[PDB]
């Protein structure tokens, strides 16, 4: 067949990474292992580590937009009530 362009991924044998010497892999058989090893320790401890490191980035903007939405919803509910019709016609006209 015809050749394609220069890609950054080969296949099994010629991946395109660098040469490796000295890195040695060790892997034992899963049939000799324990699956579900450590799931209770990592359920309460590793999960708290991941949540503690990565919750301010998700909880400050969620709190910002939820407070903005709640404030806008309360202002709208005040505007279309009976106590705020003067402000309603003022900011509407």
């Amino acid at each position: 067949g015809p050749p394609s362009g220069k890609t950054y991924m080969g296949w099994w044998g010629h991946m395109g990474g660098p040469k490796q010497k000295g890195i040695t892999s060790y892997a034992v058989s899963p049939y000799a292992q324990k699956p579900l090893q450590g799931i209770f320790h990592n359920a309460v401890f590793n999960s708290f580590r991941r949540f503690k490191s990565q919750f301010l980035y998700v909880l400050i903007p969620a709190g910002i937009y939820w407070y903005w939405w709640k404030n806008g919803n309360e202002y709208n509910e005040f505007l279309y009530s009976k106590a705020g019709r003067e402000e309603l016609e003022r900011v509407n006209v």
Binding site: K21, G22, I23, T24, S25, Y26, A27, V28, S29, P30, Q33, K34, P35, L36, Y80, S81
Partner: protein, 247 residues
């Protein structure tokens, strides 16, 4: 918009079918059909409910055949091509009271009564909205409400001004099983009946949901175990690095 223009949001009554293992009270469907045939069918149509779907839910086969024979439908024309009527069968549909929309608008002050086949699903709130609309008719509107002539007040209708007069009063329907027909009891029965007419697959759908949820939860947990088993040999790898000799 204003709270009167949204309508009053209907509260959450404890229905006998709310809940993931519950079923319609089928005696309440039977009593709701009684209050439909005796009250609601004067102005409201049921153009999507066949007679045969009532069998095995609220009445028996010989019980629905009598009602279907009590109504009349259009037959195939005779040998001379004249129009012909026919006593109904199970395969027919429940007939509405008015022959067309203009007849309905002539009979109901210009407001068309909607077809109640899907109106539990068609309105936000569902059975709560239907019950609260049917019972929540104040004897007096609140002071200051400019009400048009021929329009009653109901705070649950969006806008307040509904053109259905209050039609549920105490002991207007003599129930078959001797249930004390108050207005709220009759409202609970027609709301269960209209919810059955909206979703007649409700019982079988929750049954199949229990089967499906059990099988898929078991498959999800087994697939988690099989994932961890297949991935254990990669998950517990160790790399060491003794740096090579310079050339």
């Amino acid at each position: 918009m204003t709270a009167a223009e949204h309508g009053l949001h209907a509260p959450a009554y404890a229905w006998s079918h709310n809940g993931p293992f519950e079923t319609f009270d089928h005696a309440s469907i039977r009593r709701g059909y009684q209050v439909y045939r005796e009250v609601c069918a004067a102005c409201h149509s049921l153009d999507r409910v066949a007679w045969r779907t009532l069998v095995g839910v609220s009445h028996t086969n010989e019980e629905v055949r009598n009602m279907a024979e009590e109504f009349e439908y259009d037959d195939e024309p005779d040998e001379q091509g004249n129009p012909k009527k026919r006593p109904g069968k199970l395969s027919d549909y429940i007939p509405g009271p008015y022959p067309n929309e203009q007849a309905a608008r002539a009979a109901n002050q210009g407001a068309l009564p909607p077809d109640l086949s899907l109106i539990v699903k068609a309105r936000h709130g569902g059975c709560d909205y239907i019950f609260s609309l049917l019972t929540g008719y104040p004897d007096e509107p609140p002071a200051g409400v400019a009400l048009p002539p021929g329009s009653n007040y109901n705070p649950y209708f969006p806008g307040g001004s509904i053109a259905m007069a209050r039609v549920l009063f105490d002991d207007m329907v003599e129930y078959e099983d001797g249930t004390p027909a108050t207005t709220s009891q009759m409202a609970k029965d027609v709301t269960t009946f209209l919810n059955w007419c909206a979703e007649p697959e409700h019982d079988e759908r929750k049954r199949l949901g229990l089967k499906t949820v059990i099988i898929l939860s078991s498959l999800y947990l087994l697939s988690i175990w099989v994932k961890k088993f297949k991935w254990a040999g990669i998950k517990t790898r160790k790399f060491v690095f003794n740096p090579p000799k310079p050339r």
